């Protein structure tokens, strides 16, 4: 429901929040694209380079 | 190697130049001193043979302002008090109201305050070589600076209903301020050549 | 991005806006709507497949989620209201169930 | 303070771009609040444009004060401005 | 007697006559309120 | 090779080597090799965050 | 939905995709007079950064202006009258009684007006009661070599408020200096511009 | 699309409760040099 | 394309902060509202770009000049304004020797209809002599409809008639005229360029800049 | 890099016309105030000169003739913020 | 620059006045010559940063 | 300002001649004299120090007499001057008029202040209640009058608060009210504990509980005004919130009579006029006085 990975150890993962998306079915392409997308993490988004 | 000679020579076409740019008067020969002209004037066995004779003066072309000025070149680095207080009574006996000193390098601060008091009606002023060697007035980015009489200053403050603190200021440590020899409060009329619409005359003061 | 007519023609930023916006289209989000407990869904009533298509639009079974229709487009500076990217809609074709 | 004498007035004799604006503003205000009009109407209804017809002939009261930043001020009749 | 007056609690008083009416945005009034809440207050005069 | 190393382990350097080693149940943890300026290598790792 | 003209797009720089706006109305009379005279849209023609005007016509207007202005054009009496009125529509503006035209450039074997005569005509229709007609020569945007080697159009030239030669374009009218409309702004007051 | 001729005022500061005008717009009106308009609108 | 994508305002409360007042007082001595001057005859007084676009357009002014002479309404202007004092002193100041200050400093250009810019006089007279192909003159043939003095008066007229509105709050005009074109564009195609540069030079006005370069032209004997 | 003391020495190049990437500290400190004025004028005019935008030099005139008012040149931040006479704008802009 | 100088002023089908895109380009309305060059000749080198 | 004090000298730590110098400087700067207020330093030289102070004082008197017959520069000068003055007053440790060493004081961010007694060698030549230091500063203020007057005549309470004001319910429809209730509970506990103390290691436990409640009160205030302490917005936290006053409410504020809509262009209407739907023409209305001639229009509209 939340995505926040509350663990005594980060499980060797940089970021610890926003791990889940909601399968927004507004449109079928939005659906599939939600499934197949990947992301690198806002730890680099905070970094404009 | 011996580039010191060209240095101290060039220091004059900034010193003898600093006679008018002040209002005093000097032979057009002291402004047209060639490189070898200086050597011929101040020479000797050396090839160093310049010192102990680099000292001149000038009197006003306005015939007033009480009195005249005298320039001098103290070759000894960091002249200190044992050379500074000494070269004041020369100005006094010669009735030289204002004197000009040049030192290289690092004039000691301890031997600056105690002379700054005995200035009084006189003004030791102030420069030192290696920093003022060519005429900064000879430049593209510096407009024409002209002093003003309290007559003209009164006229300016009358035309604009001002108080003498409502105008733009110039700090005293400005190179052009000391160059012009400014007292704290006198109004400079500068001539901006800002080439967007003609050249005009702005006004500044010193506090 | 593959489901794009002649996608190898337009300057790439256009294709990029194409993906990002086509993911935000008012088409059918599915078929079994009667039992959808969602917040906000969107469905368009009169749908048809394109005339121009890449084959994989038929292969991937996209026949079961049309997202637009096929319009009679005429590029012309006629009206004077369609500049700054603007566009006009035939009244008749609109009331006719566009 | 002081009022500048009429004889010596250094302010621009021109109706400034701002002065016309404020002047017409208040003249519309007066006229709209049942003030006497010093120009014949031509069937005109907007109380404001009427002041335009008034200014166009410069037949208008309500001199203006120009304040010098020092503390002085000029008093220019609208008929006297350009 | 005419000059003097009373309080909502009944405290008699007198004076404080020189009073005028001024237009100002009420948000400034709120600022004065919360600034009085700091014991810091401005003394704005009028003509 | 990343500068962020040297500013933390000052005897270290940006030169380094890592591996994100993983158990058979897919439970990866990392451990970085820090080549320090003196010459030794420090065996960094993470536990209890 | 609130409607305005294109020529304001540029100044507001809005892309006309949906970007909404705030719409204000002054209460008193002085404020509305002030907005009416100082900051009326017609008094905002030269941006403050440099003198370059930014309000003006856009893609479609410059395009068909180029097409029509080209000397190859011709108009019977019907077209000329319909077009002149279509542009004028004085009633929606007022202040004007009756429409005046010019004679046709050619008469035989048939009367025909050119678009350049048309621009001259409209320019005449707005000529202030007593303000001498406009005389001017300024380069066009389209280089002359496009029309022909040693093409004569090249640069718009026209005296006393009558279009003589050259074709109008973005440089003539629009966000451009020393075209036609900019001289209009200077001469016949802004409101006529 | 939200019109507001008038409505509720704030609890504390009597402001129309939550259209925005100011803090960049102020620069605009004072750029035109249109004081009465500014004091009017704000 | 996508690179062009990832490549794609705090100044406007900086350059607007100290530039609130900056208003054009009536004496034509532009100050902040506190009382102290910043300039005389703002930025070469004539005016901000609006009514100074055609000052350079000598030809188009001289072309018709008859719509313009009535637009300026000479018969009213010449009534209450002075013209010959500053027009006379302008010649004497145009004598290159100093002790003849610019008339704008001596005579306010709001009423004395001879007081204009210096470079303005240089340009207008230079144009008068170089290609006067439309201004006739010899002078015996001028007295039909033109005059050397006529167009000269027209130009002195346009300048005086195109002064700044005394009372323009200009500091924010410039604040806009920098802020808008600033964030207008920020992308590049070594010296630090763009808004970082303008930031260091204006916003922090700092010693120790990042790409400090000097440039000196050489002489003949090298 | 900038060392004016140094360029004083050589006479191969004319010691009058010398463009500068600003470092307006140095140019102001040892050329006078007006030098700094014209310098930042031409400087920012170039800063926009690299772009296809033209900014009439009058606004540049004003920015310049103000930034250098005191006799030095003041940055449009806490320092220049801290000297205005109106206790309201100062209350309004950065920190109440 | 060579092949562009050769093709676009004359290589294409219909000449300046009747060509509606030549118009929208050269009249300053919308586009530029670099646009007709890309669409009609070539794309050139892809300068990325 | 306390740190710069001298309890035994009853003065500041500084020399009275430097204090007098800065006094002359500020007085002559007051009337708009800057280079003259800087010329007060061209005087070179307790009795002799008093004579120099006479020299400087009389020079200010004269220069004022000449000047008699505000701007950014002046305040920019006064501010720098007082900065240097304070940097100087904060440095001296030993008295010059008292020649003694006042017992220094150590502060705390948690609103706690005091320090240890004097040193033995210094005799040769913590946290407690606020009333003592309050009277300390009151004594300094009444004693050092002229300079302080130039600085800010009455200066006693400017740093402390005997009774704070409460706003009407009109501004408090909450959190602020609760914080006031808390500080009142604090003040009633203080009054009670003080009465317990005056009516009475008894002093140990009594002073312990007393200073505990004193600090709880002072921390209650510190929390009420500022929220950064006592880990609940404080007043300063709602002003400098950057989300409240002076920008969301003073320069930019919502208004009446202003619509907000999406735009579409139109070529028919005008470059000047804007075409508006009738909805807004209804929902946007403005006042109008009625004269005799515009009467028919207004009547028709009604
Ligand atoms: Zn003591």
From Swiss-Prot, chain A:
**Localization terms from the record:** Nucleus, Nucleolus
- Superkingdom of the source species: Eukaryota
Detail the disulphide connectivity of this chain as listed in its UniProt entry.
none
- Family, similarity comment: Belongs to the RNA polymerase beta chain family.
Listed under subunit, the entry gives: Component of the RNA polymerase I (Pol I) complex consisting of 14 subunits.
Task: State the function annotated in the UniProt record.
Answer: DNA-dependent RNA polymerase catalyzes the transcription of DNA into RNA using the four ribonucleoside triphosphates as substrates. Second largest core component of RNA polymerase I which synthesizes ribosomal RNA precursors. Proposed to contribute to the polymerase catalytic activity and forms the polymerase active center together with the largest subunit. Pol I is composed of mobile elements and RPA2 is part of the core element with the central large cleft and probably a clamp element that moves to open and close the cleft.
Q: What is this protein called?
A: Probable DNA-directed RNA polymerase I subunit RPA2
The gene name reads: rpa2
Which residues of the whole protein does the chain here span? 442 to 490 of 1174
From Swiss-Prot, chain E:
| Superkingdom of origin organism | Eukaryota
What is its subcellular localisation? Nucleus, Nucleolus
Give the quaternary structure.
Component of the RNA polymerase I (Pol I) complex consisting of 14 subunits.
The family classification in the record reads: Belongs to the RNA polymerase beta chain family.
What does it do? DNA-dependent RNA polymerase catalyzes the transcription of DNA into RNA using the four ribonucleoside triphosphates as substrates. Second largest core component of RNA polymerase I which synthesizes ribosomal RNA precursors. Proposed to contribute to the polymerase catalytic activity and forms the polymerase active center together with the largest subunit. Pol I is composed of mobile elements and RPA2 is part of the core element with the central large cleft and probably a clamp element that moves to open and close the cleft.
Report the protein name in the record: Probable DNA-directed RNA polymerase I subunit RPA2
Q: What is the lineage of its organism?
A: Eukaryota, Fungi, Dikarya, Ascomycota, Taphrinomycotina
Give the gene symbol.
rpa2
Q: Which residues of the full protein are shown?
A: 1128 to 1174 of 1174
Swiss-Prot record, chain F:
- Known role: DNA-dependent RNA polymerase catalyzes the transcription of DNA into RNA using the four ribonucleoside triphosphates as substrates. Second largest core component of RNA polymerase I which synthesizes ribosomal RNA precursors. Proposed to contribute to the polymerase catalytic activity and forms the polymerase active center together with the largest subunit. Pol I is composed of mobile elements and RPA2 is part of the core element with the central large cleft and probably a clamp element that moves to open and close the cleft.
Its annotated compartments are: Nucleus, Nucleolus
* Recorded family membership: Belongs to the RNA polymerase beta chain family.
Q: Which gene encodes it?
A: rpa2
Subunit comment: Component of the RNA polymerase I (Pol I) complex consisting of 14 subunits.
- Counting on the full-length protein, the chain here runs from 197 to 245 of 1174
**Can you say what this protein is called?**
Probable DNA-directed RNA polymerase I subunit RPA2
From Swiss-Prot, chain J:
Quaternary structure and partners:
Component of the RNA polymerase I (Pol I) complex consisting of at least 13 subunits.
* Parent sequence residues shown: 1546 to 1641 of 1689
Family, according to the entry, reads as follows:
Belongs to the RNA polymerase beta' chain family.
Reported function: DNA-dependent RNA polymerase catalyzes the transcription of DNA into RNA using the four ribonucleoside triphosphates as substrates. Largest and catalytic core component of RNA polymerase I which synthesizes ribosomal RNA precursors. Forms the polymerase active center together with the second largest subunit. A single stranded DNA template strand of the promoter is positioned within the central active site cleft of Pol I.
Q: Which domain of life is it from?
A: Eukaryota
Organism whose genome encodes this protein: Schizosaccharomyces pombe (strain 972 / ATCC 24843)
Q: Name where it's found.
A: Nucleus, Nucleolus
- According to UniProt, the name of this protein is DNA-directed RNA polymerase I subunit rpa1
